[PDB]
Design a protein around this motif. Structure first.
Motif, short mmCIF file in Angstrom:
data_model
loop_
_atom_site.label_atom_id
_atom_site.label_comp_id
_atom_site.label_asym_id
_atom_site.label_seq_id
_atom_site.Cartn_x
_atom_site.Cartn_y
_atom_site.Cartn_z
N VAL F 102 0.83 -1.20 0.00
CA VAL F 102 0.00 0.00 0.00
C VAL F 102 0.87 1.25 0.00
O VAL F 102 0.58 2.22 -0.71
N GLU F 103 1.93 1.27 0.81
CA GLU F 103 2.80 2.45 0.79
C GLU F 103 3.49 2.60 -0.55
O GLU F 103 3.62 3.71 -1.07
N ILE F 104 3.93 1.48 -1.15
CA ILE F 104 4.53 1.56 -2.48
C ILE F 104 3.52 2.10 -3.49
O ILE F 104 3.85 2.92 -4.35
N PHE F 105 2.28 1.62 -3.41
CA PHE F 105 1.24 2.06 -4.34
C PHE F 105 0.95 3.54 -4.18
O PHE F 105 0.76 4.25 -5.17
N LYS F 106 0.91 4.03 -2.94
CA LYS F 106 0.70 5.46 -2.72
C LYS F 106 1.86 6.27 -3.30
O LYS F 106 1.64 7.32 -3.92
N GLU F 107 3.09 5.80 -3.10
CA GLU F 107 4.24 6.50 -3.68
C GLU F 107 4.13 6.54 -5.20
O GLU F 107 4.43 7.57 -5.82
N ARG F 108 3.71 5.43 -5.81
CA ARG F 108 3.51 5.42 -7.26
C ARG F 108 2.42 6.41 -7.67
O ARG F 108 2.57 7.14 -8.66
N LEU F 109 1.32 6.45 -6.91
CA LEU F 109 0.21 7.34 -7.26
C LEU F 109 0.63 8.80 -7.20
O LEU F 109 0.26 9.59 -8.08
N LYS F 110 1.40 9.18 -6.18
CA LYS F 110 1.83 10.57 -6.07
C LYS F 110 2.62 11.01 -7.30
O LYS F 110 2.62 12.20 -7.62
N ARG F 111 3.29 10.08 -7.98
CA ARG F 111 4.01 10.40 -9.21
C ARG F 111 3.11 10.41 -10.43
O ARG F 111 3.45 11.05 -11.43
N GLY F 112 1.98 9.71 -10.38
CA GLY F 112 1.06 9.68 -11.50
C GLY F 112 1.62 8.98 -12.73
O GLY F 112 1.43 9.45 -13.85
N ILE F 113 2.32 7.87 -12.52
CA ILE F 113 2.88 7.12 -13.64
C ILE F 113 1.80 6.42 -14.46
O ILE F 113 1.97 6.26 -15.68
N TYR F 114 0.70 6.00 -13.84
CA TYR F 114 -0.32 5.25 -14.54
C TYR F 114 -1.06 6.15 -15.53
O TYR F 114 -1.12 7.37 -15.38
N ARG F 115 -1.62 5.52 -16.56
CA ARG F 115 -2.35 6.24 -17.59
C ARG F 115 -3.14 5.25 -18.43
O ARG F 115 -2.70 4.12 -18.64
N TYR F 116 -4.31 5.69 -18.89
CA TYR F 116 -5.10 4.94 -19.85
C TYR F 116 -5.52 5.89 -20.97
O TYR F 116 -5.94 7.02 -20.68
N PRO F 117 -5.42 5.48 -22.24
CA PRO F 117 -4.92 4.19 -22.72
C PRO F 117 -3.42 4.04 -22.50
O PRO F 117 -2.76 5.03 -22.19
N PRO F 118 -2.89 2.83 -22.66
CA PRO F 118 -1.48 2.59 -22.32
C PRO F 118 -0.56 3.56 -23.04
O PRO F 118 -0.74 3.86 -24.22
N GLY F 119 0.44 4.05 -22.32
CA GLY F 119 1.39 4.99 -22.86
C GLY F 119 1.92 5.92 -21.78
O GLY F 119 1.26 6.17 -20.77
N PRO F 120 3.13 6.44 -21.97
CA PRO F 120 3.69 7.34 -20.98
C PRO F 120 2.89 8.62 -20.90
O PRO F 120 2.32 9.08 -21.91
N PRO F 121 2.80 9.23 -19.72
CA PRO F 121 2.05 10.47 -19.58
C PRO F 121 2.89 11.66 -20.02
O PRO F 121 4.12 11.55 -20.17
N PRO F 122 2.27 12.82 -20.23
CA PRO F 122 3.04 14.01 -20.62
C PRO F 122 3.98 14.44 -19.52
O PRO F 122 3.78 14.09 -18.34
N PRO F 123 5.03 15.19 -19.85
CA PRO F 123 6.00 15.60 -18.83
C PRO F 123 5.35 16.53 -17.81
O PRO F 123 4.41 17.26 -18.14
N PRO F 124 5.83 16.52 -16.56
CA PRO F 124 5.18 17.35 -15.53
C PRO F 124 5.15 18.83 -15.85
O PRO F 124 4.18 19.52 -15.54
N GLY F 125 6.22 19.34 -16.47
CA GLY F 125 6.34 20.77 -16.68
C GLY F 125 5.54 21.33 -17.83
O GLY F 125 5.23 22.53 -17.82
N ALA F 126 5.19 20.51 -18.82
CA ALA F 126 4.53 21.03 -20.01
C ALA F 126 3.18 21.65 -19.67
O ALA F 126 2.85 22.75 -20.15
N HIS F 127 2.39 20.98 -18.84
CA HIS F 127 1.06 21.49 -18.53
C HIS F 127 1.12 22.66 -17.56
O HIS F 127 0.28 23.57 -17.63
N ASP F 128 2.09 22.66 -16.65
CA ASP F 128 2.18 23.69 -15.62
C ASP F 128 2.79 24.95 -16.22
O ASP F 128 3.86 24.90 -16.83
N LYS F 129 2.11 26.08 -16.03
CA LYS F 129 2.57 27.38 -16.51
C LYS F 129 2.37 28.44 -15.45
O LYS F 129 1.98 29.58 -15.74
N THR F 130 2.65 28.10 -14.19
CA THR F 130 2.46 29.01 -13.07
C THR F 130 3.74 29.11 -12.25
O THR F 130 4.58 28.21 -12.27
N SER F 131 3.87 30.21 -11.53
CA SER F 131 5.01 30.46 -10.67
C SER F 131 4.53 30.78 -9.27
O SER F 131 3.42 31.28 -9.08
#
Lengths: 135, 165, 106, 54, 49, 155, 161, 103, 50, 189, 116
Positions: F102-131
């Motif tokens: 469960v702790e491993i799964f929570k650590e994975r979730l905080k990173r947001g590696i999972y995605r559907y449909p299968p494939g890597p998710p977009p990079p963290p910085g591309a969507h974020d445009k705030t300071s």
């Protein structure tokens, strides 16, 4: 007169599991509204993340979903669900002793039919505060 | 109206007074109360994941075969398959008899015998559920063993047991 | 069952509790507002977060009128926590016959 | 068209429009399922007006 | 403990991840048509402009 | 098989000799040191013993008036205790593994590696445009004042 | 109810020679009526008409126009269609309601997207127009730099106080 | 004490730090700025903003809360003792066996 | 209407209750009626003595 | 192991198929490399035969084929990366593999690291899950993917082709405006 | 209408073969008609008490004195089919008691533990 009826009387007298199911919203879907009032980046034809939209987001409650962010424009169609979420989540007759006895009338929050007990200093903390104030 | 001011604000017991839900009957025609009370759910939660002290397991783990109840029921099976001794104690019979929990099916019993006691020559099995034997102790308390299922198996070759006198 | 319990409707104050739920929301029947966050927060922490000027600003209360509903007495001072009905009385009295002329509007 | 009261009609005239009256009245204050439906329709139409202006 | 603990943790994590990805699949199946409608409406807006 | 069916029977019972009491039973202090495969094997041994004991108990109940009472009845209690201890150890190991997963799964979730449909998710910085600007203030101020002072004059 | 004998020949002489279609067995069975045949022809020609996707593919947007539209200070907020109520009822009942006046009687209203709209007396249009006018005034102030000077003055007086 | 407060201002664009530095906010009416800097935030993945991922997380959290809360049973009530108080004769009749006498 | 008919519907009397009343009453009718504890007849209003 | 390179001819719309070359690393990602090599080969020696096909009444052709050819790049970005290889569908919704499901390789996942541009890896919805779907990433940093996917190879020749595919626009639906399909896939020693 | 298939209410064949109460494993993909809701308790209780009087002149799921206990019935594993009989669909439901492989310490172990 048979043993079947003899059993059935008490078997049916038995109580059943109870759950407070909020009335659905087939016409108004907060999950569908999640996409409302969003700009669309054309280079990818995708919703543009909007921190202002997230801040404005009014969080509608739901039993299946912990929250649903809906733009504050349409929140007025979910007032009843807000009351249902705020209330005690059980028939009042099961907790009306709180209203009936005086102590709970002062110790419980009865707003929007909620029956959650208010904060209450423990006797140790009460004695500590009184002794600190020297009274 | 009536003189309600004279009465203390209490609730009269209804007429007739309902009987307790507990099934006091222990005969052949006893039935299982389909009504489910929240106490059963609470007990199940506490047994499965120590509610409320421990945090709940995730839905995937709960619904997967790795959840502790299913994992234990698979790896460490808990099923008792009694044998009617008098059936084979000194009588050579092609069709012995066993007593099994009502949950087990004929295929499950066949697999149990094959993979535990190595009885692979089973032809057929006749299953019949039976109510747990009822008896009264010296005080007259109506006790009742657990319900069982008589499974009459058939074997290719006769089997028997010997008891020296 | 409510997996998420909505917080008090108007709890912007850092030290004072939120107003009675009926003043801001749409459910009356209570004269004293409550906020579990504020109640649980230690007094020293609330005082640390607040400042004397801010404390006085948030303490200042409009009496007998209501801050959220202008031109109406606040429910926390009425004999019952429900809103005063004198201003929002029904159009026609119980015994008043309907005699309203053909009014003209701009 | 929607069932209403004489007071409701007078308040609509005061607010200067059915849409303005509905928007001014809040969920709990306007205790009508028909009111909520028309409010949603009016909000969607208003957003359409803004989109058309853009 | 190390080997058995690792095996059990791996299997449980496998199950949890499988369920989570299935939930993502359901949510995507619900939400993707909404985004498609939004994009189509944006393109129709451009054409009308 | 004849041996397989005798497996349901106690040899001393067939020989008419009194069944000796077994002595001790399995304990958690030993089952913890025992391994998962060993736990399963001992569990199956206990299951076989319990089946034999239950068969003997049923036989003695059926022929109670003639045979009398089943000797050495503490064997059933000892077998039940051993099974419960094995289940206790297995549950402890399972809950430890569940907590780790469960702790491993929570650590994975905080990173947001999972995605559907299968494939890597977009990079963290591309969507974020705030300071986020941190300002150290000698004395407390109000968020309204800060917003009015730091607002974008061109917005 | 056109008779089969005359039908066969009429369909063969008209549909094949005019529209060049090919109905199936059940299609011809249901085509007994002149109304049915004309509706079938209308539906098939409507389907054959070019699709919106095809039209967009053959006439895509241009980079200059896209750049101008992006540079425009105002952009739309879509997704409003997701907010209108979605009634789940009987199809025949809905057809009856729309055909009759019930479509507006009780908190109901039909939605039809519009590109151009009447502005005379449209309070929403007037308020958004005034909003745009004040936005243009603000943009002019920013370009002239008056906003920068005002903000600097505000900061200076706040610091001085 | 009037300890040094920290104010986090979230600018919707990437020019927040440059804009703050350009602004000549040397002091506030009663407070003085002791320093302007950029708050180091761990790069937020697109999952945090993806509606699908957010909905999945919220559904999992809702299931967790439902399992933890419902059904609701009080931690104690005098009715428990009232119902569990049995008489000696009832106790003997319920849980008597020949084992006691044989022993 | 039960109130119009003067029917004594009380939970402790017949297990019923009128549907037009409020489930929670902050102060009973006697508490509302007692005005000397609500208005400034003789009671002091500010207990602080600075 | 002998076939250490893979190539594919991919065309956009009605353009000439462009050739790309892959260099694999069987030593570090044995299972993934084997799966990719098998998919690229796409060899089916079972040829259609009317009598036997009728006798068995089994449509092997109807059953999905483990061949990259005729697949498409369902997802493609501008600067981040591109995905493809979904054989059952050209949408990328679901994936298939020769092993008969979603194979797993915890050691490969742990050893994987993305610190080079213009490389390839396995596209999956979870670390353990994997399938025929591959993704070619052009961005020079993918540390947020290093521990998620598996780098079973790299692109050696097809860089301009990948850049053009990335530059290809995106339709409102989400898929590339032009179907970036696969014409043929082959191996090389 | 109903979540469970039709053959559980009216049998697949004309003899009411599959009509009865069927308990399904929580992890089984199949769906049964053993519901404990207030709306479903009457029908399941009636089936337990007096069964189903099929129009073939024969009663199904109860034609005797001892009522069945649907809460201990073996988990549902498939569905009927007139060709073969009972087609098994959810094979995972069926339990196979596979013992661990033999080993030195395994055969040295015994059900009881000696006393020091």
């Amino acid at each position: 007169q048979g043993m079947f009826s003899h059993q059935l009387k008490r078997l049916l007298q038995k109580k059943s599991i109870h759950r407070y199911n909020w009335d659905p919203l087939p016409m108004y879907d907060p999950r569908k509204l999640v996409h409302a009032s969003r700009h669309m980046d054309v280079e990818t034809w995708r919703e543009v993340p909007d921190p202002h939209w997230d801040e404005r987001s009014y969080l509608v409650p739901d039993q299946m979903f912990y929250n649903i962010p809906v733009p504050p424009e349409y929140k007025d169609a979910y007032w009843w669900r807000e009351l249902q979420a705020r209330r005690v989540q059980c028939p009042v007759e099961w907790v009306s002793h709180r209203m009936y006895n005086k102590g709970d009338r002062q110790r419980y929050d009865f707003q929007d039919l909620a029956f959650r007990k208010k904060f209450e200093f423990s006797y140790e903390e009460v004695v500590k505060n009184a002794k600190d104030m020297r009274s | 109206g009536w003189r309600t001011w004279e009465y203390q604000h209490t609730r009269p017991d209804p007429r007739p007074f309902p009987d307790p839900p507990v099934n006091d009957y222990f005969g052949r025609s006893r039935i299982w109360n389909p009504i489910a009370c929240k106490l059963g759910y609470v007990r199940k939660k506490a047994d499965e994941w120590g509610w409320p002290n421990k945090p709940p397991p995730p839905t995937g783990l709960r619904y997967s075969q790795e959840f502790f109840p299913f994992f234990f029921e698979r790896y460490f099976p808990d099923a008792e398959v009694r044998l009617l001794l008098d059936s084979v104690l000194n009588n050579e019979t092609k069709r012995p008899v066993f007593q099994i929990p009502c949950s087990m099916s004929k295929v499950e019993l066949v697999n149990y015998l094959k993979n535990i006691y190595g009885i692979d020559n089973v032809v057929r099995v006749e299953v019949r559920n039976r109510r747990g034997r009822r008896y009264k102790n010296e005080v007259g308390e109506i006790k009742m063993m657990d319900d069982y299922k008589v499974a009459v198996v058939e074997l290719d070759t006769p089997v028997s047991v010997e008891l020296k006198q | 069952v409510a997996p998420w319990v909505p917080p008090p409707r108007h709890d912007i104050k850092v030290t004072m509790p939120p107003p009675p739920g009926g003043e801001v929301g749409g459910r009356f029947g209570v004269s004293q507002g409550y906020s579990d966050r504020l109640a649980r927060t230690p007094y020293w922490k609330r005082m640390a977060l607040s400042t004397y000027k801010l404390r006085m600003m948030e303490n200042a209360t409009r009496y007998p009128m209501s801050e959220h509903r202008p031109g109406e007495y606040d429910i926390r001072y009425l004999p019952t926590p429900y809103p005063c009905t004198i201003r929002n009385r029904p159009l026609l009295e119980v015994g008043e016959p309907r005699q309203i002329p053909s009014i003209r509007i701009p | 068209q929607v069932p209403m009261v004489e007071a409701a009609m007078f308040e609509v005239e005061k607010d200067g429009g059915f849409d303005n009256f509905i928007l001014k009245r809040s969920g709990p204050e306007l205790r009508s399922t028909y009111g909520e439906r028309i409010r949603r329709h009016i909000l969607v139409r208003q957003k359409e007006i803004q989109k058309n202006f853009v | 403990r190390e080997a058995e603990q690792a095996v059990l943790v791996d299997k449980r994590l496998e199950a949890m991840e499988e369920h989570f990805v299935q939930s993502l699949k359901q949510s995507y199946e619900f939400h993707e048509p909404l985004r498609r409608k939004n994009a189509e409406d944006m393109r129709q807006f451009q054409t009308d402009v | 098989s004849a041996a397989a069916f005798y497996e349901f029977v106690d040899n001393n019972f067939l020989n008419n000799k009194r069944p000796p009491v077994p002595g001790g039973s399995w304990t958690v202090e030993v089952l913890r040191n025992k391994s998962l495969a060993d736990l399963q094997h001992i569990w199956f041994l206990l299951l076989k013993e319990r089946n034999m004991l239950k068969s003997m108990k049923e036989h003695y109940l059926r022929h109670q008036e003639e045979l009398g009472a089943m000797p050495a009845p503490s064997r059933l209690k000892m077998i039940d205790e051993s099974m419960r201890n094995i289940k206790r150890v297995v549950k402890e190991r399972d809950e430890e593994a569940t907590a780790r997963a469960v702790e491993i799964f929570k650590e994975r979730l905080k990173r947001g590696i999972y995605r559907y449909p299968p494939g890597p998710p977009p990079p963290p910085g591309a969507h974020d445009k705030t300071s986020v600007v941190k300002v150290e203030l000698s004395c407390y101020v109000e968020e309204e004042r800060l917003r009015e002072l730091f607002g974008r004059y061109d917005v | 109810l056109e008779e089969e004998t005359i039908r066969e020949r009429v369909i063969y002489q008209v549909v094949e020679g005019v529209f060049r279609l090919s109905p199936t067995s059940a299609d011809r069975r249901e085509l007994r009526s002149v109304a049915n045949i004309i509706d079938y022809v209308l539906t098939h020609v409507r389907a054959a008409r070019p699709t919106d996707r095809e039209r967009r593919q053959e006439r895509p947007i241009t980079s200059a126009a896209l750049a101008v539209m992006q540079k425009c200070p105002i952009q739309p907020q879509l997704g409003f269609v997701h907010a209108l109520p979605h009634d789940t009822r009987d199809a025949l009942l809905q057809e009856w309601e729309r055909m009759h006046h019930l479509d507006w009687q009780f908190g109901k209203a039909v939605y039809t997207p519009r590109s151009k709209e009447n502005v005379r007396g449209n309070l929403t249009w007037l308020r958004e127009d005034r909003h745009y006018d004040q936005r243009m005034k603000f943009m002019q102030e920013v370009e002239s730099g008056e906003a920068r000077a005002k903000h600097m003055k505000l900061i200076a007086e706040a610091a001085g106080n | 004490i009037e300890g040094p407060w920290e104010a986090y201002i979230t600018y919707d664009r990437e020019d927040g730090l440059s804009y703050a530095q350009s602004l000549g906010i040397t002091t506030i009416g009663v407070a003085t700025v002791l320093g302007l800097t950029e708050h180091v935030r761990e790069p937020q993945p697109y999952a945090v903003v993806d509606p699908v991922y957010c909905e999945a997380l919220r559904r999992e959290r809702a299931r967790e809360e439902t399992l933890m809360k419902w059904p609701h049973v009080p931690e104690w009530k005098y009715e428990y003792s009232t119902y569990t108080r049995k008489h000696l004769a009832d106790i003997v009749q319920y849980n008597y066996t020949n084992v006691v006498d044989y022993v | 209407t039960p109130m119009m008919l003067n029917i004594q519907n009380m939970m402790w009397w017949n297990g019923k209750r009128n549907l037009y009343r409020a489930t929670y009453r902050e102060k009973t009718w006697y508490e509302i009626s007692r005005t000397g504890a609500f208005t400034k007849g003789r009671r002091p209003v500010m207990r602080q003595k600075y | 192991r002998i076939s250490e390179r893979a190539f594919m001819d991919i065309a956009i719309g009605t353009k000439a198929p462009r050739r790309i070359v892959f260099k694999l690393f069987p030593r570090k990602c044995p299972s993934a490399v084997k799966n990719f090599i098998e998919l690229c080969s796409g060899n089916v020696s079972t040829d259609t035969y009317e009598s036997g096909n009728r006798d068995k009444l089994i449509s092997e052709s109807a059953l999905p084929q483990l061949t990259y050819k005729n697949s498409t790049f369902h997802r493609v970005e501008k600067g981040y990366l591109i995905q493809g290889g979904d054989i059952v569908t050209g949408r990328g919704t679901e994936q298939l593999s020769i092993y008969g499901g979603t194979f797993s390789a915890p050691e490969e996942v742990r050893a994987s690291v993305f610190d080079k541009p213009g490389l390839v890896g396995t596209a999956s919805s979870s670390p353990n899950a994997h399938g025929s779907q591959f993704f070619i990433l052009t961005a020079k940093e993918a540390n947020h993917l290093n521990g998620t996917c598996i780098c079973f190879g790299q692109v050696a020749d097809g860089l301009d082709v990948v850049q053009e595919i990335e530059q290809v626009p995106i339709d409102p639906s989400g898929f590339p405006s032009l179907k970036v399909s696969i014409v043929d896939c082959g191996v090389l020693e | 209408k109903n979540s469970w298939p039709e053959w559980m209410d009216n049998g697949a064949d004309g003899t009411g073969y599959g009509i009865g109460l069927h308990r399904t494993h929580p992890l089984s993909r199949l769906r049964g008609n053993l519901k404990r809701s207030p709306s479903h308790v009457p029908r399941v209780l009636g089936m337990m008490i007096q069964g189903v009087w099929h129009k073939s002149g024969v009663k199904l799921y109860f034609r005797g004195g001892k009522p069945p206990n649907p809460s201990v019935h073996p988990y549902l594993t498939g569905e009927p089919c007139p060709l073969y009989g009972w087609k098994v669909t959810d094979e995972s439901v069926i339990r196979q008691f596979n013992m661990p492989s033999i080993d030195g310490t395994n055969f040295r172990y015994k059900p009881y533990v000696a006393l020091q």
